[PDB]
Amino acid sequence: DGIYAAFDTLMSTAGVDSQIAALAASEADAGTLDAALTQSLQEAQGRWGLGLHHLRHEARLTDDGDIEILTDGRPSARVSEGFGALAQAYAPMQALDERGLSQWAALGEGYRAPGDLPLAQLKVLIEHARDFETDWSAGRGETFQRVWRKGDTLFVEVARPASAEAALSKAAWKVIASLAQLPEAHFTVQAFVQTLSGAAARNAEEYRAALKTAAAALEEYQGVTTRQL
Amino acid sequence: DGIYAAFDTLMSTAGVDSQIAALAASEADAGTLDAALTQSLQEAQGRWGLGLHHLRHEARLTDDGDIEILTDGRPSARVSEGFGALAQAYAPMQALDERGLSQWAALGEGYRAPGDLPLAQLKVLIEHARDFETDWSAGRGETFQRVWRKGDTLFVEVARPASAEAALSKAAWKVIASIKDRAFQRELMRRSEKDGMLGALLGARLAQLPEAHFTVQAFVQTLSGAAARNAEEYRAALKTAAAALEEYQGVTTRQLSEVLRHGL
Numbered sequence: 001d002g003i004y005a006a007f008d009t010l011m012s013t014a015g016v017d018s019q020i021a022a023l024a025a026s027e028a029d030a031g032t033l034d035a036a037l038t039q040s041l042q043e044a045q046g047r048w049g050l051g052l053h054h055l056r057h058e059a060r061l062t063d064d065g066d067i068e069i070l071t072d073g074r075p076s077a078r079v080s081e082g083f084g085a086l087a088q089a090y091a092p093m094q095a096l097d098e099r100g101l102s103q104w105a106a107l108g109e110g111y112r113a114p115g116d117l118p119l120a121q122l123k124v125l126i127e128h129a130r131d132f133e134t135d136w137s138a139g140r141g142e143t144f145q146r147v148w149r150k151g152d153t154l155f156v157e158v159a160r161p162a163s164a165e166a167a168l169s170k171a172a173w174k175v176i177a178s179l180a181q182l183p184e185a186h187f188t189v190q191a192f193v194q195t196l197s198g199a200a201a202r203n204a205e206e207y208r209a210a211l212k213t214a215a216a217a218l219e220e221y222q223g224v225t226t227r228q229l
Numbered sequence: 230d231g232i233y234a235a236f237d238t239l240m241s242t243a244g245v246d247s248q249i250a251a252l253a254a255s256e257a258d259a260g261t262l263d264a265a266l267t268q269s270l271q272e273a274q275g276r277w278g279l280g281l282h283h284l285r286h287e288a289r290l291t292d293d294g295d296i297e298i299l300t301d302g303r304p305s306a307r308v309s310e311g312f313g314a315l316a317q318a319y320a321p322m323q324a325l326d327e328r329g330l331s332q333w334a335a336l337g338e339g340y341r342a343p344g345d346l347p348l349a350q351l352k353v354l355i356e357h358a359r360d361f362e363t364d365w366s367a368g369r370g371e372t373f374q375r376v377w378r379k380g381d382t383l384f385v386e387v388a389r390p391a392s393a394e395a396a397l398s399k400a401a402w403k404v405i406a407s408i409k410d411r412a413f414q415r416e417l418m419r420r421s422e423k424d425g426m427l428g429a430l431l432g433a434r435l436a437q438l439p440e441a442h443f444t445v446q447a448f449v450q451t452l453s454g455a456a457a458r459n460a461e462e463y464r465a466a467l468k469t470a471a472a473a474l475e476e477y478q479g480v481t482t483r484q485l486s487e488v489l490r491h492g493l
Contacts, residue, residue, distance in 0.1 A: 111458075113357040121353045128342040128350065129358035202340075 006079050007037065007059070007067050010086075012228060013187040014044035015221040034060050037067060047221060049159055049190025051094050051102025087186035099144070100161035100190075106148050107133045115146055122147075123204040126154070143215065147207065154201035158214045159191035160222065171229040189225050192218035235308045236288070236296050239315070240269050241484060242443040243276035244477035263289045266296060276477060278388055278446025279319055280331020282377075316442035328373070329390020329446065335377045336362045344375060351376075352460035355383070372471055376463065383457035385466040387474050388447035394427075396444045400485040401427040407486075434492040440485045448474040 004021040011018040018040035024033060037059040045057045058070045067079040069086060077089040095103040105112050113125070115137030125132045126149075133148035136159075143160040167188050168179070179185055194214035200206045233250040240247040247269035253262055266288035274286055287299040296308040298315060306318040324332040334341055342354065344366030354361050355378075362377035365388075373388045405421065408414040420429035435441055450470035456462040 107359070110359055111357075117357070121357065124350045124353040125358055128340075128346065129354055129361050130336070130339055131359045132357065133359070 003067050003079055010183050011040045011044050013183045014047040015224045016040050016043045046193040047189050051104050053106035054104050054108050083183035101136050105133050126204045127202055154196040156194045156210045156214050158218050161190050164188040184229050189221045232296050232308055238439050239312055240273050242439045243273035244480045245269050245273050275449040276445050280333050282335035283337050312439045312442050313436055330365050334362050355460045355463055356458050383452035385450040385470050387470040390446050393444040398427045400482050401430045404486045404489050445477045445481045
């Protein structure tokens with residue numbers, strides 16, 4: 001019960017409302033819970049901005065009542081170990097630049113197109129290419145963006161890097177106007193990823209919409225976690 | 230004359246000089262031969278126009294001195310069964326449209342870009358997409374053409390589908406012309422007016438004929454590294470492979486001819 005609750009907390013930093021403790025309280029089957037814990041972890045991975053879209057992210061129930069968080073099937077950390085432990089197990093996988101963006105390609109080693117292509121070269125990729133990835137590009141509001149397709153799914157990302165420490169500082173002096181075991185000290189909402197499927201993942205107007213959508217998402221979620229905090 | 234010459238004869242049908250019989254006899258190192266069979270076999274597949282780019286091809290030596298032809302790691306045929314045997318092992322695997330073109334994608338199931346794309350749009354694909362594939366379009370010289378990229382290698386296919394029958398027909402004409410004994414030439418030329426040409430020339434003496442089951446129908450140029458992302462390297466690639474396909478068609482027609490002159 002501690003363990004599901006703690007997980008619920010971890011996801012709360014990404015504005016993900018996993019409801020795992022409740023769903024457990026409902027006597028849901030172990031498979032249903034696993035599925036729920038994995039869906040959430042992937043949803044949070046999208047928004048956390050750590051840059052691990054190239055690894056598989058899973059979370060699963062263990063016999064001793066723990067949750068085990070894996071990456072590419074390799075047991076990375078446990079929740080009963082604390083939010084710090086998870087932070088310290090993710091770190092050697094990332095690779096940030098000087099603005100704080102991931103340097104990995106979400107599609108893995110391979111060719112990466114300019115972030116800045118004309119929207120008509122982008123439209124050709126979108127309509128007639130199988131897989132493809134672009135790199136970051138400077139967008140509005142100090143955010144950055146990029147797009148890739150993997151399978152039947154087009155992935156739009158909008159990312160405005162911000163460290164966890166600063167958000168904590170803001171909400172701290174905002175509460176005084178009114179920490180190592182807090183996940184908000186390692187995890188915050190930096191990015192948002194919108195997905196398109198089937199016909200939509202080959203439609204250029206649809207990609208443009210999905211940009212405006214992911215951009216409005218990132219700003220809402222960035223704010224929600226600050227108001228929780 | 231041995232299983233290596235049998236494999237060498239089968240490779241001449243795509244105009245591949247494998248040199249397998251000479252390697253087997255050379256002072257080379259153990260294992261270099263299997264590698265050679267597979268190298269020669271894959272090149273041959275590029276030219277046969279069978280449409281099997283999605284399968285993996287291998288040839289090895291077996292425990293009883295035979296050469297085994299593999300598809301996706303599974304035993305498909307044995308060289309000693311003759312070349313017809315190889316033809317029908319490939320058949321259930323193929324899928325030809327009305328024109329003689331493979332209906333399979335070279336990249337397996339997935340999206341195929343149009344084959345009639347505008348050059349400005351095909352370029353974007355060539356400079357920035359990862360793996361991609363186009364459909365068959367027509368090209369110049371009553372040819373067809375498609376292009377894919379798998380990895381770091383661009384694959385430019387030019388094809389002019391033909392039945393091995395017509396190829397045998399075209400080689401018969403070339404021979405009944407070069408004939409020295411003008412009397413027998415006019416005899417053949419008259420039977421050819423009646424019973425057909427390749428008909429009347431065979432009639433002076435085929436399923437054992439390797440070219441009866443395999444023919445040069447296509448060619449695949451390949452680009453690597455920087456050229457593979459270059460749209461003008463692509464347009465040149467297309468002219469090279471059409472010239473290649475004419476060449477190897479010419480080589481294999483002159484070969485089948487010199488084969489038809491034996492037994493006259």
